[PDB]
Design a protein around this ligand. Structure first.
Ligand SMILES: *[C@@H](C(=O)O)[C@H](O)C(=O)N[C@@H](CC(C)C)C(=O)NCCCCNC(N)=[NH2+]
Length: 212
């Protein structure tokens, strides 16, 4: 795998989104990985529905949080609609996937990166955007404006985001806090520290969709 990956440069990343107050990061993270794998496999970059996962993932708890793995398993089992078909409302509502016609995309499964293993995560990022989790509760992360983020942070992971690239010192993260946070909505998080957890627990729980 190469020294640099940046799926934005491959046209595989949609604009940065803002989840708002709803604890829907798990769905945004999942959606980033679906948009990416659909671009990688088909050549078209589309936006898909975080709201659909929020409403329809019966293992998640809506705006009270959820599981990126559950959302990706939902897109592989049923599918997902375009974002314009099922727009983001920032609140869990009834599942309306039935009422919006056939799905726009469907994946074939979900694979987990071997946790606590930087190279395994880098290998998955070289192939596609990856859903990852991290500790975002610290003010250092909350107030991050730019640069390669080194913390301070613990590994108490609480926030799902998406890894869309990396470099020699960093992993490139698409957050769902709008375009005014970080580096136009992105954060570069230090890697190569020898901490199995990753900076901010970045290697704790990482998933990506599989699409044949
Ligand atoms: C993410 C966010 O919007 O910042 C949101 O809080 C979330 O999904 N958190 C996850 C933790 C990370 C994805 C690792 C979470 O808490 N998942 C477990 C389910 C939520 C807690 N349980 C209930 N019943 N609400």
């Amino acid at each position: 795998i190469p020294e640099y990956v940046d799926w934005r440069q491959k046209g595989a990343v949609t604009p940065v989104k803002n989840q708002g107050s709803c604890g829907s990061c798990w769905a945004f993270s999942a959606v980033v990985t679906i948009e990416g794998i659909i671009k990688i496999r088909t050549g078209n970059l589309n936006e898909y529905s975080e709201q659909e996962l929020l409403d329809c993932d019966r293992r998640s708890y809506g705006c009270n949080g959820g599981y990126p793995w559950s959302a990706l398993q939902l897109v592989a089992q049923y599918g997902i609609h375009y974002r314009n078909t099922y727009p983001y409302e920032g609140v869990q509502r009834y599942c309306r996937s039935r009422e919006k016609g056939p799905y726009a995309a469907k994946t074939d499964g979900v694979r987990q990166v071997q946790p606590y293993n930087e190279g395994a995560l880098l290998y998955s990022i070289a192939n596609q955007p990856v859903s990852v989790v991290l500790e975002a509760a610290g003010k250092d992360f909350q107030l991050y404006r730019g640069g390669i983020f080194v913390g301070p942070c613990g590994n108490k992971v609480d926030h799902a985001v998406a890894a869309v690239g990396y470099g020699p010192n960093y992993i490139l993260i698409k957050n769902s806090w709008g375009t005014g946070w970080g580096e136009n909505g992105y954060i570069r998080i230090k890697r190569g520290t020898g901490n199995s957890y990753g900076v901010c627990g970045l290697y704790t729980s990482s998933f990506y969709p599989v699409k044949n």
